[PDB]
Each structure stands twice: as structure tokens, then as C-alpha cells.
């Protein structure tokens, strides 16, 4: 019988880990790419907090079973606390020291309490993702309210039975891209005490070279015996990069929205499957692909479907996109398990910027 | 080694049969429902000639290597002549006995060809499907080039030996509602002769009284011992109707078409799973449906997806009712081999349309 929690790491390469996570609904193995359950394989996928408090709301989901039973997903579930979307998507917001009203009200009680109604393995504290750019001031003062309210996180979680003894808990770093604020955050992430510690407040608009540049020095600053989520990260090369600085769990809407828009990840950089030169072209989407697409039909069909305004035409490229992350994951665990992770990671950067 | 084509009836009660066709790149079991290929077992699915045509040109799918190669399927494959898709779906039309000019030309020798660059096993002759409602004079100098149109087809698919060896070729029969026209436009494409004959220019607004008085009498002029396919055709009741007037073979775009607008087809009758009454219904699309949709999940988890704008909503729908369609015709030929098809309409019939 699988405990709760466990996290351990089977080899090393650099800052560069790999191994698994144990918890009572399967395993989860690192570093791991986590899509979107509503996508369409993945050890763990996320649910949406933020719209299923909307439509049709965290009482109706359990009582129609929970997330499991409704998805037909029986292995983990991780669920965001549901902040960062209102704060991006919420018409109008009003922010206090007892949570954000919007148009409902998110706290951390009742982010933790949805997400259990939710019956989701991996919760996320209630947090805030201060703004890109942030001053000094108000990065630390954001930061120090989502401490605050991770301890509040960290309190209703361990009041509720059966989520604190089936489930996990997560707190998340802030401090923008101070490197005081990031150790301060992760020093008080660290006294409340979670079974993982997510990297927050990154891929706002930061871009690459800074997003890296503050995990340079943000990540080591986490315990270094649980997992290092990176949130919203993000593209290939981004998670290559992240891996390479520690991280060991990602999620990003990227190869579903890139799917439903006519773009395909490859080996040699991403493709428009709508532009024309692909009209003609005999080959898979990309050519290494085992993915069940790759196997059976070309660019050329996939952009004919994609220009007809078929919808298997998008369905090919999503379940494409969402196959060639997981090729991406097992590619960077097996390199950092075989210790030639340094060379995957210079061999792929060279052939996914040359673009051919 | 299959022939190019062989129909044989296994078993008939009434007017209705079922059995084979047999053709080199494999069996049709009838009655048929032949779905659109671009939807997503059949045993034949349509290509549409109207639209390769345009995008991205009947040349260049065969450059391509044909449309069994362009869409990975090796069954057989049938394409209409595009003249009703041209006269439906394009913005001007200029008709004359050499055949129809629109914003390319479309004659019974062009469509041929576009139909052996495409590749198809079941070609369509080019005909002109009359608009309903027509008078007598206009019904008949319609359905009379269209038989003009019926010979010119036929000579240009018996002149290309890898058409006239591999493919088959059927007649549309036309005439309107008018009983005399029907016996005529018959008798013309019996002396041609062809493999197969469909019942065209039904289907066009006359509404289901009227189709079936047609069939009544128009399927028993066709050639008994030759395939009878009702073009455009149609819902479930439809379908077992047609059955019981001698119809074969059947196409229509509304599985797939009410797949993407949130119709979903059942044992009672069709439901449009986007409607609130099914938020929290747990059961399968259908309560008897195989497919692998209702085998694992409910209502609610689907009207949630489209009700989202996911477009997994609408393929999930789009699978289900595709494969409501073949069980509907399987137990359609079961119930015509065990002489129990008169049961099995009577019985369908009061389900459906209980609407429970
Ligand atoms: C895209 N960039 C980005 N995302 C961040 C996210 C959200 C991560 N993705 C959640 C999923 C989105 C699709 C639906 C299901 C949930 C962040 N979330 C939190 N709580 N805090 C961040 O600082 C935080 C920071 C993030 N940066
Ligand atoms: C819907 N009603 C209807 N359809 C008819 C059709 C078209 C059948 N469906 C073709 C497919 C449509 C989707 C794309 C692939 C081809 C008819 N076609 C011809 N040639 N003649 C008819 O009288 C004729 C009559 C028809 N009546
Ligand atoms: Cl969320
Ligand atoms: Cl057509
Ligand atoms: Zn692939
Ligand atoms: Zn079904």
C-alpha cells in the first residue's frame, strides 16, 4: 500500500534530479510534465479550481463523486488554489488581508475547502502571484501575505481528516525576482512545514533569461528532500532549462492551447501546421514521434483538417502536443538517470533553435 | 482475392435486405451507414469530392498518393459526383448541358477523373439533384440530363482502366416525387447499367411522409439484385424506414454535424447534452451504447466539457454518435437475418420517439 506522500530521488546530474513521487493513487515520476485534465502518458493531470468553483461549483463535484469519479481519472490530481486565475481572469477583484472577493469569495480556508470537495491529491496553498514588474515594497509585502496565508493554508488543510491523511499540501515561494524576498519565503514556507514547495510569481512576463536567473538562486533555497514545482512553465526549452536548475514538476496550457491554435511541438522547434509549405508534406508532425499521430497520418492531412475547420484536425495536434511533452519528460529523466543529462540538454537546444 | 464488386443478399424480410458487398480493398456489410471520413466500425467511409477539389485540388491528392494514402485509411472509400455540393455550397453557378460552371467547371468526364485522382472505390455519376419542390416539365428536363449525364459518366469510368478495373460505379436515379419520372430515370440507368443504384434528389425539404411515399414506389424500379444507396440520408428513423422500403446504403452529415453543436444520439431519441437537466446526470451518453465514450463517462462530465468550450467535448459526442450510427445498423442487419426487422422498427420506434 503506497503512503501518502513520498518523495525520493533516484539519481542526480548537476542540480538535475530524478525519481518519483509515491502517493495512495499511483506514482508520479520526476521531473513531470502535468497537462490539463481536460485535454483529452501523464502521471498526474490538473484539474481547473478556479472555473470548477464557477461551473458547476466544488459542492456539485462532490456531490456528483469528486473529480475523479467525474473525470474518469483515478490516478492523482493536482489542483491550483485558484488565486492566480482570478487575479487573470476575474472581471473585478477586491483583495483584503481575508482573501479576494470577485465576480464569490477565495480565502485560503475556503480555496482548501474547494479544494478537498474537489477530492484532489496535490493542494496548493492559497497564494498570491505579485505582478511583473514589482517594486521592492510591494514584492515583500505580497510576499509576506502569502505567508500569512500559507500558514492558513497549512491550518485548514490539517483540520480536515481525510484530505490531511490522503492528500498533499504544497506552499508556494514568492518575492518576485528578489533574492532576499525569495529567502525569506522559502525560510517561512519551510518552518510551516509542506510535502512540496512550488516556485511562484515566475512566467509573468519576466521572460526567459530573467526566469532562469532568479532560479539560479530561488530553487537551492527550497528543502532539497521534496519536490520543486515550477508553476506555468512552460515551453520545451524552458523546461530543459528548469530541470537543469532543479525543478521537478510543471504545468502549462501551452501544448493544449498551442494544439487548438495550429501549432505542433518538434524536435526541431515548434511548426505552424496551417502554413501552406506543409500542404505537401508526407511527414509526421515530427519525425522521432511515437505518438499514436506520428504513427498513422502526415502534416499534410492534419493541415488539410486544421484548414477545413475540422475538429479532429485540432484533437491530432493536442493529443500530439500532449504525447510530445511526455517524450520530453522521459527523454530528461532517462539522461539525468544515465548521467549524459548535460548532453541531452545541449543537444537539444542545438537542434531546436536551428529550426529545421 | 476480392472481385472488383459483388453484391449478395444473404437474407430479406419484406422489402428490406441484408448482405455483402464485396470489393478489393474489402467487405461492406449491409445496410451501411457510411460516415464522412474526416469525422474521427464503418466499413466504407465518403470523401468529399467538393471540397478536395478546392483544397487542395484533386491533382495534388494524387500526387499525395491518392485519398486512401492523404486520410491513412485502406477500406474502401466513396465520393460523390460534387455537382449537388456545387449547386449547395457555392456562391455562383452557371449550369448548361456540358455540365456546371461555379466561383471551375464540373462535367460528368471532369468528375469522373476528380473522383480516379482521388482514388475512390464507389464513384458517384454526375448528376443534378432537382430542387423541391419542381413542377412536372422542370422535374423532368432535369431528371432527363441527368441521364444524358448518367451515360456521359459511365463512358468516362469505363475509359481509364485503373478505374474501370478497381472502382465501381453507381447511377442516381432522379424524377422528383413524380412516379412516371422515377420509372423512366430507372429505366434509363438500367440499360446503361451500373453496379449500384441510388435514389437521388430526396432529402432536399420534402420532409419524411413525403420521402417514404417516394421509396414506396421509386426502390422496387431499381434493379433488385444491385445495391440501392439513399443519398443524404438521414436520422435513425429515417434510416430504419429507408431500410424497410429496400435502401441499402445510407449517407449523412448529422452524426457528425450534431456532434459539434451538442445533439447526441440515443435509443430516446436525441438529446442536447448542453441543456441544465443534465449537469448532474450520471449516467452514459446512452444506457446501452458500446462505445468506448459510454463505457466511461457520464452526461455530466460531457456537458461540463462543451458547456467549457472544450473541444474534447464535441469529439467525445462526435465518437458517441458515429458509433450509435453503426449499432443502429448492426442491429439492423441482425434483426433482417433473424426475421425479427419488423419487431426491431416497430420496437425502435416507440422508444425513440417516447423521447424518455
Ligand atoms: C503561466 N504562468 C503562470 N502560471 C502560474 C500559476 C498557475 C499555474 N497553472 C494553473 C493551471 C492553469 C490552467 C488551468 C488549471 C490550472 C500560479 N499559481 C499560483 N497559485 N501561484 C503562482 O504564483 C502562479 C504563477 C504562475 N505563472
Ligand atoms: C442531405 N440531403 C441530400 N444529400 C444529397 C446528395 C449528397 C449526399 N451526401 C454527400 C456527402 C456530403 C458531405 C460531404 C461528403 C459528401 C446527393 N448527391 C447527389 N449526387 N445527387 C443527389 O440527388 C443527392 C441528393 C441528396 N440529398
Ligand atoms: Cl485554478
Ligand atoms: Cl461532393
Ligand atoms: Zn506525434
Ligand atoms: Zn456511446
Chains 1, 2 share one sequence.
Not at 215 to 226: R, Y
Amino acid at each position: 500500500d503506497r503512503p501518502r506522500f513520498s518523495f525520493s530521488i533516484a539519481a542526480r546530474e548537476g542540480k538535475a534530479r530524478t525519481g518519483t513521487i509515491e502517493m495512495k493513487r499511483g506514482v508520479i515520476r520526476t521531473p513531470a510534465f502535468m497537462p490539463v485534465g481536460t485535454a483529452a502518458g501523464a502521471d498526474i493531470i490538473l484539474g481547473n479550481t478556479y472555473h470548477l468553483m464557477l461551473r458547476p461549483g466544488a459542492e456539485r463535484i462532490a456531490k456528483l463523486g469528486g473529480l475523479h469519479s467525474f473525470m474518469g481519472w483515478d490516478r492523482p490530481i493536482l489542483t491550483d488554489s485558484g488565486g492566480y486565475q482570478v487575479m487573470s481572469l476575474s472581471s473585478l477583484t477586491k483583495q483584503s488581508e481575508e482573501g479576494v472577493t470577485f465576480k464569490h469569495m477565495l480565502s485560503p480556508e475556503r480555496s482548501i475547502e474547494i479544494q478537498h470537495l474537489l477530492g484532489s491529491d496535490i493542494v496548493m496553498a492559497f497564494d498570491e502571484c505579485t505582478p511583473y514588474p514589482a517594486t521592492p515594497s510591494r514584492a515583500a509585502s505580497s510576499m509576506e501575505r502569502s505567508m500569512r496565508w500559507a500558514k492558513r493554508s497549512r491550518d485548514a488543510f490539517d483540520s480536515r481528516k481525510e484530505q490531511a491523511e490522503n492528500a498533499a499540501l504544497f506552499g508556494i515561494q514568492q518575492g518576485s525576482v528578489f533574492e532576499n524576498l525569495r529567502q525569506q519565503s522559502a525560510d517561512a514556507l519551510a518552518e510551516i512545514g509542506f510535502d512540496g514547495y512550488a516556485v511562484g510569481g515566475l512566467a509573468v512576463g519576466e521572460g526567459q533569461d530573467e526566469m532562469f536567473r532568479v532560479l539560479d538562486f530561488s530553487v537551492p533555497m527550497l528543502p532539497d528532500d521534496k519536490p520543486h514545482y515550477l508553476m506555468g512553465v512552460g515551453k520545451p526549452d524552458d523546461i530543459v532549462g528548469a530541470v537543469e536548475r532543479g525543478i521537478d514538476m510543471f504545468d502549462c496550457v501551452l501544448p493544449t492551447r498551442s494544439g487548438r491554435n495550429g501549432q505542433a511541438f518538434t524536435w526541431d522547434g515548434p511548426i505552424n501546421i496551417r502554413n501552406a509549405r506543409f500542404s505537401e508534406d508526407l511527414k509526421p508532425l515530427d519525425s522521432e514521434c511515437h505518438c499514436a499521430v506520428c504513427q498513422k497520418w502526415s502534416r499534410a492531412y492534419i493541415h488539410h483538417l486544421i484548414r477545413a475547420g475540422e475538429i479532429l484536425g485540432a484533437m491530432l495536434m493536442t493529443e500530439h502536443n500532449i504525447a510530445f511533452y511526455q517524450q520530453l519528460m522521459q527523454k530528461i529523466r532517462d539522461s539525468i538517470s544515465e548521467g549524459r543529462f548535460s548532453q541531452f540538454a545541449q543537444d537539444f537546444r542545438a537542434r531546436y533553435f536551428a529550426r529545421n
